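assembly run, all chains below
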Amino acid sequence: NNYDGDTVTFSPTGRLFQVEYALEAIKQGSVTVGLRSNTHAVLVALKRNADELSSYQKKIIKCDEHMGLSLAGLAPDARVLSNYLRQQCNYSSLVFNRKLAVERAGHLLCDKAQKNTQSYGGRPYGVGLLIIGYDKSGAHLLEFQPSGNVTELYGTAIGARSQGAKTYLERTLDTFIKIDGNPDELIKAGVEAISQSLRDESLTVDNLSIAIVGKDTPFTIYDGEAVAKYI
Amino acid sequence: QQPIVTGTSVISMKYDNGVIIAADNLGSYGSLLRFNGVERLIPVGDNTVVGISGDISDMQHIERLLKDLVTENAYDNPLADAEEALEPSYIFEYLATVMYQRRSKMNPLWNAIIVAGVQSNGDQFLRYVNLLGVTYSSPTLATGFGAHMANPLLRKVVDRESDIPKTTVQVAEEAIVNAMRVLYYRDARSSRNFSLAIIDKNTGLTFKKNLQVENMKWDFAKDIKGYGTQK
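ok done. output:
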């Protein structure tokens, strides 16, 4: 393959192989589930440890009390993109005194990611993001891919084996979208979804983390004994 | 650095269901009453009016900035006519940012600005910014010469926020019109021709152009003879 050496090269079929390989980085990452109702949006993340002596790596990052994200893949790229998103939300608040819409944040990430696909010398981001937020248009969930594609979804999963959780979410959409009064039941729906991506592993207070955001629910991360209720 | 063509006072007032703002139509050139059709109330959507005093060239620059802001807000925003329309508070914060940055570059926009509007929650918005970036709110706001003469009259109607629910649009409009008349009596850079805008949380923006100061009293001047002793 002579065409995979850089982002600025199309293959004879119009593929961008470096972008595809950066997506393979995401596919190697551990599963994250996102799902939302009309009132609440939830992230569920399986963390991985390096070994029995290591901590579990953080999968979820707060942007704002109205917004936050979960990562799969190359965590330093998620740090870069999270700092950029924090700066954009901050700028919107400082200059307009308005909460940045989640859709506009997603497009700002799309545009930042696209530049690395178009010009020499950089590289694509190696990280997929699930962004949840609540704004004047209600609950939102976005999936970011470092091709620069951003899609608004009721639910999705990214990372390894995530198609099992995605299939479960597809099967149960018409239930969980209605869960508007009851954030804990939406969390339980997400935890049941991510269980479909587990292989030879179980959820524990160590490896599970959850976030939720919503109408009167500032973005909050539950981890440790705070998730024992949902296991 | 030095204002050349200038607008004079903008005056404004909260009332029970909205805000009223008025400005005369004159561009003066020093003492020369040079330009007589200068509109100084800039509507921004259906919920906001920006009243500008001071340098007319900087006013025209601000009006351009506001049209651009509406265009940019519509980009990739299918709710730009709805819950993601510009609010008065967004427009004010943007203008105040620009004004203070310009001041800090020692290159002021030589203007005093009142942003009048109704928030989507129905709250009255009424806030002032000047060329220094100094901002304040009050139930009545007036720029320039109107600060010295119109504010006393409007405050006789709305002296405190608990007077706002007692104050009808009829009373407020009558007070604004009388204050414009007083300014025509006493401001040498005023015009009898003015524009008035009403922003009502129910009846929306009503923008009244080509109003004229009427019912002036001059007949007592017949009795004035000399300056002391001339019979």
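The interface with chain B takes residues 94-98, 101, 103-104, 107, 136-137 of chain A (CB under 8 Å).

The domain at 1-231 of chain A is CATH 3.60.20.10 (Glutamine Phosphoribosylpyrophosphate, subunit 1, domain 1).

not gonna interpret more than that til we talk
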